[PDB]
Design a protein around this ligand. Structure first.
Ligand SMILES: Nc1ncnc2c1ncn2[C@@H]1O[C@H](COP(=O)(O)OP(=O)(O)OP(=O)(O)O)[C@@H](O)[C@H]1O
Lengths: 427, 408
C-alpha cells in the first residue's frame, strides 16, 4: 500500500485551478468575491448547506442536482463541495457521454469512477527492529540485532517473549519485530551463512539495510481505484500506458483481494476510508439501468456524494420507451436528490471572472481588452471567451508586448471561432 | 584422533608410534610408496589392497593415506555388505560412495567464530580479549565437539557455514587470545564432496528416517543440476575438482557386477584412490562360479597393488588399549592393561577393546578409581569372544568327546 501512488485526471480540474473553494462567512452567507468566485450567491449558499448536511450525516440516501445552462458555475460548485468537505478528498468529474463505452459495460465504467470517488486516509507510525538475532537470557528477553550499517542490543517486553516462542527462533535469524502489536519471524534465514553450493535453496534472507531502529512514517491519501490500478500490474510508465483495447487487467477477483485488505486496515484502526464526491455532468445522457445502479449505490453508507448536473429542461428518459421527465432524471431518482439552480452571469459579472482567470494563468491584459472579451462572454458562452486568454497572450508576445490589447484579442476571435459561428460561416 | 600417516619425509621410514598411528611399519612404508607412485604418475588408475588379520588398523592406514595427499581431501569408509540394501539399488549405493569421495574446492566468504572457551541441551560460553558472549548449544553441535574432545580454556575456530570446530590450541596449560570481535567473514577454501552437494540441494531428510520411508536415494534430476553446475564451475575457474580416497571393507562380499562398476568409475581421469580391504586368506567370488585369493576376479588381482598388515606384538597392543582407555575416560592399574593385552594375544583386539567399557561398570559398582585385574577377569568370564562362544554352543549341542576320551 506504501508503493501505491495516486494517479489523478488533472486535465478535467485544469479549468478550475483558479477556484480555492466556496467563499462564505461563519453564519453561512456567501461573499461578493471570495475563494475565486464571482456572483452565484443563491447556488453557492445552497450547496454551502449541503456540505454541512454531509458533515452532520443527514444526507440519508440523498444527492445533489445542479440545474442551469452551459457555463453557469455547475462543475465549479461541485469542486467547491469537495474542497469544503475536508483535506485531500476525492472529486470525480464525469459526463454522461463517458459511460457510453465500446468494450466495458455502462456500469463497469461507472464502477471505477465510484472507486475514484472513495479514498483512504492513512496515519500509521511503526517502530522497525530489523536484523539478525544474538540471544541473551535476563530475568524478559535480550536480543542483539545486526544490520548492514549498524548493531544494537535491546531488552524486549514480556509481551514479545510470548509471541517469539510461538514462531520458532535461533541465533542468526533475520527478524522484523514491531512495538505496535507486531510479530514476524524468518526461521534460519540469513545470507551470511549461505554456501555457494546450493542455489535453488532461497531459505536465506539478506542483511537489512541502514540501522536496526527505524521510525516509519506512512501518510497516504489514495482512492480505491488507485489500489486496483497498482495491484493490476504483474508503475511510473503506467501514467501514460493504456494502449490495449480490451483492458482485461482489472478483474472482479482482483478487486476482492483489495476489499479484504482494506477491511483488515479498518479493523486494526490503522486507516479509515473516507467517501468523497462523484460529479456527473450531462445527467440526462445516463441510461435507466445506470440510475437503478445509482439508487442501489445511494443506499450504501460507504457511498460518496453523488452530485449531478443537467443543462436540459424537459428530456426523454434514456433506457425507457420515450418518457419525458425533468432534467432527464427518472421520478424514482429525481425525488432522491435536492435541486440547486445556477443563474447566468450578466456582462458586469463576466469581466470580474476574466481578471481572476488571467491572473492565475499568467496573462497580463489592458482594461479595454477585458471589456471586449466580456462582450463574447454574453453574446457566446463563458467557456469560449475564457479560452481566448491563451492565444491572445502568444499574439502579444509575438508583437513584443506583455500586456494584451483589443487588437490582439480581435485576431483571436478571427483565428479561433466558436462552434456556433464556425457552422453558420460554411452556409 | 588420527593425525596422519606417521612417516619420515625424506627416508620414508615409519616411526613405531607417530601421527595418531601405532605399529605396522611394513604396511605404512608400503602405503608411503603407493602415494609417491600416484604423485609421479607411475601408477595410473590402480586400486590398493590392504590384506591382513582382523583389527590391524586397516581403516587407520587408509585414513593416513588421505591426510598425507592433501590438506582437505575426502575420505569415506564403505563396507561391502552395506551395498546390498533392501531399498536402494546397489548401483546407487556405489554411486553415493564414489560421489562421497570426489570433492570441489571453492573460495567462499563465511563467518568464523574464533576465541577462548568457558564450558558449562547445554550452554557453552566463549571469550575474546575485547568481548564476551553466551551461546545456547545446538543438539548437533554438542555431538560435533565431543568427538573433537573440546575442554574449557581451548582456543577454537568454528566456521558457521560448514559447522566444523577446529582446535587452534590453548592459552594456558601456547597461543594468545584473538583481538577483535568473534565473527569475522574471510575468503576461506571450502571442500564439499559431490554426494554432500546432492544431499544439500535435495529434499531434507525428516526426523526418524529409519522408522519409515525410502533411503537417501538422490533423484536423477537433482544430481543432473549439481553435475552441470560443477562442470560450469570447472571451466569458469571457480571450482577445483579434488579426487579423494574411497575405502572398501569386506571386499570378499562384492559381486562381479560391483567390480565392473568400480573399474568403470576408476576409468575416469578424476577417479579417487580406491583402497580395498580383505580380512580373508582364501575366499570364493560372488556371482562367479570360480574361486580366488581375496575374493577378487582373475582380472582385478593383476591390476591391484597389494599391501599386508601384520599381527600386533604385546608391546604394540600395550599402547593401543591405553589410547582407547583414555578416549573412553577409564583408569587402569598396570596389571589390568597387561591382562587386557594378554586377551588381545589369543582373542581379537576388538574383543579386548569391548572388555574395557564393560570392566569400568563393574569397577563403578565396586566404587573404585582404579580398574584392576579382578575387574577385567570378570568381563572375560561374563562376556565371551566369538571363538569361545561357538565352543560353548558346540559342546552344549552335542558332546563331541565323552568322559572316557572316546569320540562319537
Ligand atoms: N461564479 C464563478 N466565479 C468564477 N469563475 C466561474 C464562475 N462560474 C463559472 N466560472 C468559470 O467558468 C469557466 C468555464 O465554465 P464551466 O465549464 O466550469 O461551466 P460550469 O457551469 O461550471 O459547468 P458546465 O460545464 O456543466 O456548464 C470555469 O473556469 C469556471 O470556473
Amino acid at each position: 500500500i506504501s508503493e501505491v501512488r495516486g494517479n489523478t485526471r488533472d486535465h478535467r480540474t485544469a479549468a478550475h485551478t483558479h477556484i480555492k473553494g466556496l467563499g462564505l462567512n461563519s453564519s453561512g452567507i456567501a461573499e461578493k468575491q471570495a475563494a475565486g468566485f464571482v456572483g452565484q450567491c443563491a447556488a453557492r449558499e445552497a450547496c454551502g448547506v449541503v456540505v454541512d448536511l454531509i458533515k452532520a450525516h443527514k444526507m440519508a440516501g440523498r444527492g445533489v442536482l445542479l440545474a442551469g445552462g452551459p457555463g453557469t458555475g455547475k462543475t465549479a460548485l461541485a469542486l467547491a463541495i469537495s474542497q469544503e468537505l475536508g483535506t485531500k478528498i476525492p472529486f470525480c468529474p464525469i459526463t454522461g457521454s463517458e459511460i457510453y463505452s465500446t468494450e466495458v459495460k455502462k456500469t463497469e465504467v461507472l464502477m471505477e469512477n465510484f472507486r475514484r470517488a472513495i479514498g483512504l486516509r492513512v496515519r500509521e507510525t511503526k517502530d522497525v527492529y530489523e536484523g539478525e538475532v544474538t540471544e541473551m537470557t535476563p530475568e524478559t528477553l535480550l536480543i542483539g540485532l545486526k544490520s548492514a550499517r549498524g548493531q544494537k542490543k535491546l531488552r524486549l517486553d514480556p509481551s514479545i517473549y510470548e509471541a517469539i516462542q510461538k514462531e520458532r527462533v535461533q541465533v542468526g535469524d533475520v527478524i522484523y519485530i514491531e512495538t505496535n502489536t507486531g510479530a514476524c519471524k524468518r526461521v534460519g534465514r540469513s545470507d551470511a551463512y549461505a554456501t555457494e553450493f546450493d542455489l535453488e535453496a532461497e531459505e536465506y534472507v539478506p542483511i537489512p539495510k541502514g540501522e536496526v531502529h527505524k521510525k516509519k512514517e506512512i501518510v497516504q491519501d489514495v482512492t480505491l481505484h488507485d489500489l486496483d490500478v497498482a495491484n493490476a500490474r504483474p508503475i511510473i510508465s503506467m501514467m501514460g500506458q493504456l494502449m490495449k483495447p480490451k483492458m482485461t487487467e482489472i478483474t472482479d477477483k482482483l478487486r476482492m483481494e483489495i476489499n479484504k485488505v482494506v477491511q483488515k486496515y479498518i479493523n486494526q484502526g490503522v486507516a479509515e476510508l473516507i467517501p468523497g464526491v462523484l460529479f456527473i455532468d450531462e445527467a440526462h445522457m445516463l441510461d435507466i439501468e445506470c440510475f437503478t445502479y445509482l439508487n442501489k449505490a445511494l443506499e450504501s453508507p460507504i457511498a460518496p456524494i453523488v452530485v449531478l448536473a443537467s443543462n436540459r429542461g424537459i428530456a426523454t428518459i434514456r433506457g425507457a420507451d420515450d418518457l419525458k421527465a425533468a432534467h432527464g432524471i427518472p421520478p424514482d431518482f429525481l425525488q432522491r436528490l435536492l435541486i440547486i439552480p445556477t443563474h447566468p452571469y450578466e456582462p458586469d459579472e463576466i469581466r470580474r471572472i476574466v481578471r481572476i482567470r488571467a491572473q492565475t494563468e499568467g496573462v497580463q491584459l489592458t482594461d479595454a481588452a477585458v471589456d471586449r472579451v466580456a462582450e463574447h462572454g454574453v453574446r457566446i458562452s463563458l467557456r469560449y471567451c475564457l479560452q481566448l486568454l491563451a492565444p491572445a497572450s502568444i499574439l502579444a508576445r509575438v508583437n513584443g508586448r506583455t500586456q494584451v490589447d483589443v487588437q490582439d484579442i480581435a485576431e483571436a476571435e478571427e483565428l479561433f471561432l466558436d462552434a456556433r459561428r464556425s457552422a453558420n460561416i460554411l452556409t | 584422533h588420527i593425525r596422519g600417516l606417521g612417516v619420515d619425509a625424506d627416508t620414508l621410514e615409519p616411526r613405531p608410534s607417530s601421527q595418531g598411528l601405532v605399529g605396522q611399519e611394513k604396511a605404512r612404508k608400503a602405503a608411503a610408496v603407493v602415494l609417491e607412485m600416484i604423485k609421479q604418475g607411475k601408477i595410473a588408475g590402480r586400486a590398493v589392497l590392504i590384506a591382513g588379520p582382523p583389527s590391524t588398523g586397516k581403516t587407520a592406514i587408509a585414513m593416513g593415506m588421505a591426510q598425507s595427499l592433501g590438506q582437505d581431501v575426502p575420505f569415506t569408509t564403505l563396507a561391502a555388505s552395506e551395498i546390498f540394501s533392501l531399498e536402494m539399488s546397489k548401483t546407487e549405493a556405489l554411486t553415493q560412495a564414489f560421489r562421497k569421495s570426489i570433492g570441489v574446492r571453492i573460495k567462499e566468504e563465511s563467518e568464523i567464530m574464533e576465541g577462548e572457551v568457558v564450558e558449562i541441551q547445554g550452554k557453552l560460553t566463549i571469550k575474546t580479549t575485547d568481548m564476551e558472549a553466551i551461546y545456547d548449544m545446538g543438539s548437533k553441535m554438542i555431538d560435533a565437539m565431543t568427538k573433537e574432545r573440546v575442554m574449557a580454556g581451548d582456543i577454537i575456530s568454528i566456521d558457521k557455514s560448514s559447522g566444523k570446530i577446529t582446535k587452534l590450541g590453548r592459552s594456558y596449560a601456547f597461543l594468545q587470545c584473538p583481538e577483535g570481535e568473534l565473527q569475522k567473514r574471510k575468503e576461506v577454501v571450502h571442500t564439499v564432496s559431490l554426494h554432500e552437494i546432492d544431499v544439500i540441494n535435495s529434499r531434507t531428510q525428516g526426523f526418524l528416517a529409519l522408522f519409515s520411508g525410502d533411503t537417501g536415494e538422490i533423484r536423477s534430476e537433482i544430481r543432473d543440476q549439481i553435475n552441470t553446475k560443477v562442470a560450469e564451475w570447472k571451466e569458469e575457474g571457480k571450482a577445483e575438482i579434488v579426487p579423494g580416497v574411497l575405502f572398501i571393507d569386506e571386499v570378499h562380499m562384492l559381486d562381479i557386477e560391483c567390480f565392473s562398476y568400480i573399474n568403470r568409475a576408476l576409468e575416469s581421469d578424476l577417479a579417487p584412490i580406491v583402497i580395498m580391504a580383505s580380512n580373508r586368506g582364501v575366499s570364493r567370488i560372488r556371482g562367479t562360479d570360480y574361486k580366488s585369493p581375496h575374493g577378487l576376479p582373475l582380472d582385478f588381482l593383476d591390476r591391484v597393488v597389494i599391501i599386508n598388515t601384520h599381527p600386533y606384538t604385546p608391546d604394540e597392543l600395550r599402547q593401543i588399549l591405553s589410547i582407547r582407555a583414555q578416549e573412553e575416560e577409564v583408569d587402569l592399574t598396570p596389571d589390568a592393561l597387561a591382562l587386557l593385552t594378554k586377551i588381545g594375544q589369543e582373542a581379537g583386539l576388538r574383543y579386548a577393546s569391548n572388555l574395557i567399557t564393560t570392566s569400568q561398570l563393574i569397577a563403578a559398582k565396586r566404587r573404585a578409581k582404579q580398574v584392576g585385574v579382578e575387574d577385567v577377569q570378570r568381563s572375560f568370564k561374563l562376556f565371551y569372544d566369538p571363538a569361545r562362544s561357538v565352543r560353548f554352543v558346540q559342546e552344549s549341542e552335542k558332546r563331541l568327546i565323552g568322559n572316557d576320551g572316546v569320540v562319537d
